Amino acid sequence: ATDYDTFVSERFGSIIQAVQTFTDSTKPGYAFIAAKPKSGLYLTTVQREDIKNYLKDYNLAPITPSIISPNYLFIKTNLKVTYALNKLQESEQWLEGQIIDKIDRYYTEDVEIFNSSFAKSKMLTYVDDADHSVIGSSATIQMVREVQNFYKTPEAGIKYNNQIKDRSMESNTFSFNSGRKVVNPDTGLEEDVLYDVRIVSTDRDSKGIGKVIIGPFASGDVTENENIQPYTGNDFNKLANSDGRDKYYVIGEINYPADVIYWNIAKINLTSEKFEVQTIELYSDPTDDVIFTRDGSLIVFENDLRPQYLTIDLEPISQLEHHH
Amino acid sequence: VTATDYDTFVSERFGSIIQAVQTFTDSTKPGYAFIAAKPKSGLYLTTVQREDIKNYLKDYNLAPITPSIISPNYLFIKTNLKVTYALNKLQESEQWLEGQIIDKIDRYYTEDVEIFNSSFAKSKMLTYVDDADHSVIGSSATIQMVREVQNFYKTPEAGIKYNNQIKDRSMESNTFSFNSGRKVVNPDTGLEEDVLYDVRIVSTDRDSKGIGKVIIGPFASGDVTENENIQPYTGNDFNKLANSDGRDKYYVIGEINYPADVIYWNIAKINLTSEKFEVQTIELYSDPTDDVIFTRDGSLIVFENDLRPQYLTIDLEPISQLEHHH
Amino acid sequence: VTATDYDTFVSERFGSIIQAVQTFTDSTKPGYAFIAAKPKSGLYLTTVQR
């Protein structure tokens, strides 16, 4: 870690706020250094080529350390703060600002650091701490791993470094392109029907394993031969429809206890071409309210840039027959 | 007159073995001036029944209204704490550690919460819990409000309230034994008196006006006599308990007004005599919608772990160290 | 307020032809503050009625 990270952390301390090295058991030979810009999220490919070009500075001929951006774990927070009407001078809009700062001040200080961790109980005491009028808060978290490629998990897998619950793992939705014509003079003569779809996990087996299955289809546009046939279990979360779509299929699988997640859309004869996205986001409920980082993973609150991962509900109180 | 004037009156003539006073008057009970009194040490003033609450009676000035020196209507917090710490950061035992967090959970209560018209917040106390070591990483909790009920048979004339809002089905008591008149045998033993099963009081989802039933069960088909009035509660709509004895027929005996925050029941509404029940006092648990619990009139949120240990479970969890290498 | 405060009030502004004062309030007769007054000499204060 610090053996080489620190140096770098000297010649570049004006940008990078977090640097640590690690190996991949598997990508033998390769040493990577994750670095987080103090100034946001991803170092720029120019900022990256400069930093790599101090590798020559310190003479090493062997292929030498790949710099790269950190594997972020995000907390989708659903915050609720109840406050006293009397004791609150400015706008609700102000108050939010006042606390959404506190959250960040906790993250920067105690969390946004390698192998340091997020404790929901701590940041809530930060929230409480934001005004002299913030009587008490509560909070509900999710974990977000932002997936680089939707089509197949890495060679190795995707892991949260944390225990999730059953059926918990679920990506967002991405358009699948069937291939049929719609024949609609509204928008010409042909739209190419494309219905949303997601990738969810099902319940632990006898032995700790689930199945990573993929959202609703219309019989025809997925070819089934004995082997590859519709999944049947109802041990997962189906999604809102308006269409006659209820045929989910099975790729990869979740090892709940070892938290590893592998899937590969290929397991059903569907080329990347068929989906109009390239990136997705995987969510899942933690088991605990204390969540952890490990090799090159970093937990981070970047809220003016990932605002979708915080929501604040306030509850103004006076006196009082009622706060819900 | 004036409750405030009275509160003082006692924060003087007794201001010795008394910590706090709430002089409130109940709108259901005219001409009666009620005086809540915290013992400053324990829970009940003359649990010996007056020894004390009679001495204060013996303080008279003016008015046609009469004092009724009572002990405070206590709100309890059944906390299921789940603190987690770092194996290495810890030098003394889990045993010494518990005795360290509850030292804080107490510090919070007795400074901010254990007061009249004062309140409790889970988030705020879990800050105090977290603040007991160099680690101690974080903490979880799962709380319920508890109201201790003397005479399980029936609530007061005017119902019992929490001074807080609870959730649908949230309200449920601990279990108690109901002596069915009947008799059975096993294991070579004999009649074994009268068959007993564990029975209890639960609330149902609120109807379209904010109002569910307060029901009691299960039973046998059974040990309760059904009338035009007395009939098994009609439908699923709440929390049933383990029929390790197979039973299930519950009966309506009151209702919760969720908005008004009032709960009334009377076991006499079916026809069971208190004789058919082992108990006298029971516990009434509900879980709030409140991220803040409010005390109020004669109500008081207190934390007495020593004398009320049952209302706190701490499950610790040790954690492996991270990086020790550099 | 306070009957005691009132008793004085009169053991001053009148403390001349008055011997004693009892300011009590009757629980049957609200909003009325009653002032007993011994004439210090006879029986009735203004038996002449006021």
Side-chain angles (χ1 to χ4, degrees):
Chain A
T2 68
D3 139 311
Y4 176 114
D5 323 344
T6 61
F7 287 93
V8 160
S9 198
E10 298 189 299
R11 294 213 164 194
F12 291 87
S14 48
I15 34 183
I16 91 196
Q17 75 150 305
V19 243
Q20 138 172 134
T21 320
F22 69 91
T23 111
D24 206 326
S25 357
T26 153
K27 282 154 145 183
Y30 302 98
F32 322 77
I33 53 260
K36 169 188 198 311
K38 75 127 190 288
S39 21
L41 270 159
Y42 316 112
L43 279 180
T44 180
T45 157
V46 46
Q47 276 172 326
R48 294 182 183 174
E49 290 188 327
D50 304 337
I51 175 57
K52 198 172 216 145
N53 289 151
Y54 293 93
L55 294 174
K56 292 179 179 179
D57 218 24
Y58 197 84
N59 43 9
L60 197 52
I63 54 278
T64 81
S66 348
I67 72 69
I68 73 58
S69 291
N71 190 44
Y72 294 105
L73 213 228
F74 289 103
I75 314 291
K76 233 260 250 279
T77 309
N78 241 77
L79 181 70
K80 285 152 186 76
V81 186
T82 103
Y83 70 108
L85 266 170
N86 351 138
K87 314 311 163 89
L88 199 253
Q89 308 290 30
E90 279 84 355
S91 185
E92 263 190 12
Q93 170 76 345
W94 176 78
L95 211 260
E96 284 187 350
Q98 209 60 26
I99 71 192
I100 170 155
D101 277 342
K102 280 298 190 161
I103 290 181
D104 190 66
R105 212 269 211 160
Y106 162 63
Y107 264 86
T108 38
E109 278 189 298
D110 302 7
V111 180
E112 306 203 3
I113 286 178
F114 284 86
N115 311 306
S116 216
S117 47
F118 177 86
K120 173 217 285 192
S121 29
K122 229 153 190 183
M123 87 141 176
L124 286 172
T125 110
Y126 267 77
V127 180
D128 280 9
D129 192 13
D131 197 77
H132 274 96
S133 144
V134 177
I135 265 165
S137 63
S138 65
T140 261
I141 69 187
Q142 254 188 313
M143 284 186 309
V144 203
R145 218 88 224 213
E146 282 172 332
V147 179
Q148 299 260 49
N149 176 61
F150 75 102
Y151 194 84
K152 47 160 284 80
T153 38
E155 33 309 329
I158 149 66
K159 56 163 43 213
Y160 281 109
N161 302 320
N162 269 280
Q163 216 59 45
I164 77 180
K165 309 185 181 197
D166 254 15
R167 300 137 147 265
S168 172
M169 191 218 60
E170 63 169 30
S171 77
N172 71 76
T173 45
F174 43 79
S175 326
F176 162 71
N177 192 3
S178 55
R180 322 141 162 159
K181 101 281 179 182
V182 71
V183 173
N184 58 351
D186 302 50
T187 174
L189 303 135
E190 281 202 358
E191 274 294 329
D192 221 331
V193 160
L194 21 58
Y195 51 72
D196 276 14
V197 145
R198 61 183 195 155
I199 69 211
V200 196
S201 93
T202 73
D203 287 316
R204 299 161 195 253
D205 77 355
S206 16
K207 100 188 219 318
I209 296 282
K211 294 276 195 172
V212 173
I213 91 170
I214 183 174
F217 292 98
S219 191
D221 42 35
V222 199
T223 66
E224 307 139 25
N225 4 263
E226 156 247 2
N227 63 336
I228 275 184
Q229 256 82 69
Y231 177 87
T232 167
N234 271 217
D235 55 340
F236 59 84
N237 305 293
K238 309 205 173 188
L239 55 27
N241 249 26
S242 303
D243 300 297
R245 302 190 280 113
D246 83 342
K247 323 209 174 191
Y248 302 66
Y249 293 66
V250 193
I251 49 194
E253 61 185 18
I254 329 80
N255 190 121
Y256 280 90
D259 80 320
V260 261
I261 316 190
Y262 180 97
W263 78 72
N264 186 318
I265 304 305
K267 293 179 180 176
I268 60 179
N269 304 324
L270 284 185
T271 22
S272 264
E273 291 71 281
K274 295 271 196 169
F275 312 84
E276 317 209 326
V277 294
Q278 222 282 332
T279 188
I280 71 176
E281 301 140 355
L282 211 50
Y283 306 92
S284 46
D285 290 66
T287 288
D288 310 331
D289 282 356
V290 181
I291 89 145
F292 304 97
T293 48
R294 216 185 184 168
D295 273 336
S297 306
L298 190 72
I299 282 157
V300 68
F301 181 73
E302 276 281 350
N303 191 103
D304 40 14
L305 180 176
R306 182 61 60 180
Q308 21 168 172
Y309 295 156
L310 212 214
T311 92
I312 302 194
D313 312 331
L314 289 74
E315 195 176 355
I317 279 15
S318 224
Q319 295 103 28
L320 155 300
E321 186 222 82
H322 223 295
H323 97 128
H324 198 35
Chain B
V1 241
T2 95
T4 222
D5 269 341
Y6 314 21
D7 287 12
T8 78
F9 230 92
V10 176
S11 271
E12 295 185 344
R13 260 296 298 174
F14 296 89
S16 117
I17 80 264
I18 271 183
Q19 187 176 4
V21 214
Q22 256 303 257
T23 290
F24 60 94
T25 150
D26 187 55
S27 46
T28 273
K29 306 190 160 200
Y32 277 125
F34 297 110
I35 339 286
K38 175 162 169 63
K40 173 181 301 185
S41 310
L43 284 187
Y44 303 105
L45 274 201
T46 180
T47 179
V48 293
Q49 341 103 18
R50 293 162 260 172
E51 289 177 350
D52 323 353
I53 79 173
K54 168 178 168 57
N55 255 28
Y56 314 102
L57 255 303
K58 298 174 185 179
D59 279 66
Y60 289 115
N61 310 60
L62 143 188
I65 76 197
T66 134
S68 187
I69 298 72
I70 45 83
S71 284
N73 195 355
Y74 292 104
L75 231 221
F76 286 97
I77 324 272
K78 221 275 180 164
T79 317
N80 292 353
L81 203 46
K82 326 263 175 50
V83 175
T84 107
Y85 64 99
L87 267 168
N88 42 103
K89 302 278 196 58
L90 218 198
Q91 317 300 39
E92 255 78 7
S93 184
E94 285 189 358
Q95 162 101 344
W96 163 91
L97 174 158
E98 300 189 6
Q100 210 66 16
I101 78 166
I102 141 172
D103 278 340
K104 288 287 191 185
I105 291 183
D106 192 73
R107 210 260 213 172
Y108 166 57
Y109 263 93
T110 73
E111 284 200 353
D112 312 346
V113 166
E114 293 194 3
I115 277 148
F116 280 124
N117 295 328
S118 179
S119 66
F120 166 106
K122 178 218 284 193
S123 86
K124 221 156 197 86
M125 106 172 154
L126 284 191
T127 99
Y128 279 75
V129 154
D130 283 4
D131 177 16
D133 213 32
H134 192 93
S135 141
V136 202
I137 302 174
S139 75
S140 306
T142 296
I143 75 176
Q144 277 172 312
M145 296 175 300
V146 201
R147 221 93 231 237
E148 275 152 9
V149 170
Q150 26 263 43
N151 198 45
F152 74 108
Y153 193 64
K154 73 154 301 180
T155 67
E157 24 274 335
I160 91 183
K161 26 163 40 67
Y162 284 92
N163 303 8
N164 297 263
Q165 208 88 358
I166 75 192
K167 312 184 148 210
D168 276 5
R169 303 174 188 194
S170 155
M171 192 214 73
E172 66 184 47
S173 66
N174 66 343
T175 44
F176 44 72
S177 277
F178 163 62
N179 168 40
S180 83
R182 301 170 316 176
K183 48 285 142 292
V184 75
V185 190
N186 220 347
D188 190 296
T189 92
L191 265 207
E192 279 278 323
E193 316 41 86
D194 10 28
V195 186
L196 317 196
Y197 34 38
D198 271 2
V199 107
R200 71 163 181 188
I201 299 162
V202 156
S203 52
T204 79
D205 296 328
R206 70 196 68 204
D207 79 323
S208 18
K209 182 203 166 207
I211 285 199
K213 309 300 174 201
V214 172
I215 61 183
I216 183 178
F219 289 89
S221 322
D223 272 310
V224 154
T225 37
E226 306 170 13
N227 280 333
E228 171 174 17
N229 293 315
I230 300 164
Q231 292 281 308
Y233 181 35
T234 37
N236 196 359
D237 188 22
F238 60 107
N239 295 344
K240 323 181 161 203
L241 64 38
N243 64 344
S244 38
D245 288 294
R247 321 136 295 152
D248 138 39
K249 262 193 167 171
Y250 303 93
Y251 294 103
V252 180
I253 61 157
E255 46 184 47
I256 359 83
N257 203 170
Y258 284 108
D261 174 34
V262 300
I263 328 177
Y264 183 85
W265 78 80
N266 205 340
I267 302 175
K269 297 194 172 194
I270 43 187
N271 289 300
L272 310 175
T273 327
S274 32
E275 267 62 29
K276 285 212 192 75
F277 306 94
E278 52 174 16
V279 285
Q280 262 281 232
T281 176
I282 68 167
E283 344 280 321
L284 197 49
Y285 301 102
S286 59
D287 38 71
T289 343
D290 310 31
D291 291 328
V292 164
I293 322 289
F294 313 99
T295 141
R296 163 150 335 157
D297 272 332
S299 276
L300 188 49
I301 298 183
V302 72
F303 177 76
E304 290 288 319
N305 190 73
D306 48 19
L307 214 167
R308 209 60 64 158
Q310 24 170 185
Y311 295 156
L312 202 177
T313 92
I314 303 162
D315 294 286
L316 308 91
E317 175 178 5
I319 258 332
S320 4
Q321 147 131 235
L322 183 301
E323 251 223 41
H324 214 15
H325 210 230
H326 273 126
Chain C
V1 242
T2 95
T4 222
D5 269 341
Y6 314 21
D7 287 12
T8 78
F9 230 92
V10 176
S11 271
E12 295 185 344
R13 260 296 298 174
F14 296 89
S16 117
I17 80 264
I18 271 184
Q19 187 176 4
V21 214
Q22 256 303 257
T23 290
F24 60 94
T25 150
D26 187 55
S27 46
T28 273
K29 306 191 160 200
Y32 277 125
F34 297 110
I35 339 286
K38 175 163 169 63
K40 173 181 301 185
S41 310
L43 284 187
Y44 302 105
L45 274 201
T46 180
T47 179
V48 293
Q49 341 103 18
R50 293 162 260 172

